[PDB]
Symmetry: C3
Subunit: 228 residues, 3 copies
């Protein structure tokens, strides 16, 4: 149920993540090759983690209240950030391995990703209004950098690969660009920021984004000839 009806999206999110996970598992049963197997392992682990995170939220674990200096009280699902701290580096690993990026480049993006998620958690938890928006601005700046780097650095890495790999990379890159860019906007319009929509709407929006970014992304990756 949740605080303001948002439990329905928490439940549907749990289910959607679980089904993606099982589909991926079903799909990888015959995989023998180590590189290919690796893509399965990372891509199954992603919605496992998101499914468990969603379920914990559905049950109200991982839900806090933050009282701002405003007097405003904000209903903060902080378990999302726990989810994000691990699933976003894994997503970056997934596409970096696809791109054939070096270990040092993947590590650089993982470092900037972690920075983005943690500064976003500070934005979400801080009581001081100006600090909320300062950290949201820090985190978004880091996001813009991360995305530019994904395009330029992973794009360069993938440029000497075969056409199947370049086309799959471009698809996955565009999923990241479009869906990841919406998260900070969603934070800003939802209850953590300007409150233009309430918790129910914000929770719906993240559920859709997460599902696209994990199960949609995973679907496109795992069905590609590029990983075989």
């Amino acid at each position: 149920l949740g605080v303001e009806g948002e439990g329905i999206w928490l439940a549907l999110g749990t289910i959607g993540m679980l089904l993606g996970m099982l589909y991926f598992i079903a799909d990888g049963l015959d995989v023998q090759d180590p590189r290919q197997k690796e893509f399965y392992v990372i891509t199954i682990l992603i919605p496992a983690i998101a499914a468990a995170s969603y379920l914990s939220m559905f049950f109200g674990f991982g839900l806090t209240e933050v009282s701002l200096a405003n007097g405003r009280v904000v209903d903060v699902y902080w378990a999302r950030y726990a989810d994000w701290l691990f699933t976003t580096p894994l997503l970056l690993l997934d596409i970096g391995l696809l791109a054939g990026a070096s270990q040092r480049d993947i590590g650089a993006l993982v470092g900037i990703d972690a920075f983005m998620i943690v500064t976003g958690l500070v934005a979400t938890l801080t009581k001081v209004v100006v600090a909320r928006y300062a950290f949201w601005t820090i985190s978004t700046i880091s996001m813009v950098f991360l995305l530019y780097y994904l395009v330029a650095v992973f794009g360069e890495a993938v440029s000497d690969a075969d056409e199947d790999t370049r086309s799959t990379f471009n698809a996955l890159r565009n999923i990241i660009l479009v869906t990841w860019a919406i998260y900070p906007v969603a934070w800003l319009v939802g209850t953590e920021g300007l409150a233009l929509t309430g918790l129910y709407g914000e929770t719906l929006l993240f559920m859709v984004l997460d599902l696209v970014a994990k199960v949609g992304f995973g679907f496109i990756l795992l069905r590609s000839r590029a990983i075989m």
Copy 2:
């Protein structure tokens, strides 16, 4: 000492870990070879972390009350999980390096292990009784998988090694299989779950399990010809 006499097991456990650590250190003083030396470092770090966790719990810092949604109050040593989050992947690294497993395979197992421990911690901290059991179930399923994968995947990797190595692997594998499998049982029968035993018994059980899984395991590993 402690809430209901259980501090004695916290103290013995501290001392035990510390003793195992010191012995391990004393044992590796003349080791020059980097691979052999790596086994020492990992196997010394494990009881260090566990000794420090045990000491924190003995002094009460590793201990919190969790009030359930039915009114039951549960006395929770959450420091265990802090310990487990790091020591279980290090133990898996140890035996994986023994087995000659690939980087990919150790990483996969470590991902599943981390998943297991974190969903365990959720099981332990959540206020809703059905959630407690749901997460204990998710974590136990992950464990069964981890243990299956340890046997099939690390066993396959070690199958091409020399006889001493396979023998030491089999001994260490069986220590993991038997001792790790008892932990979900301990949780279920202890105060976190069905409360068949109290805090004193439950603490004794985890002390014995941890000592076997860390110092017993470490002893068997570091004395083998396989690592020299």
Copy 3:
């Protein structure tokens, strides 16, 4: 602001870290080589993390009160530890990469570093006074070992390198030795320990130490011929 005027050192620390970060970014713009580039990425990420930590503290989010069994109430800037938990391994990685230390050796020091930071956080947060000093002692022991291993192990790794690299390594090593050894002394003399100085003096001291250990260190590294 802050508890007792110490926000001025939080503000100057923020600004100091940010300006170091910016300098380093501006300094790395033309870098083509992957190894040189990696040194820039690490050394930019360090003061970015420290600037975000300092700003969070400046706004009051990286601060909590702790009531000791003493009755004494300590104003704890816990976000320092979050910072240190990531920045001290990255510093070790930086110098390790400079030393040409093996992956094993770097991982071993990062292990012991993490142990040192975590046990220091336990020291800072525990209410039982004897426990606070016991953990401070454990953490300091780990630090002395870490510093020794830095000198012996990383010094041996760098002993076959060219003169510029050896000379840069010795400068950076000496920065670590003097500055890092002072942190436990600040904790001891500051409000967490003997309270010989109040929060304002202690905050000032950590600001100075952090700026030398991150921006001073970074400056010396990134201007060296060794990394080119």
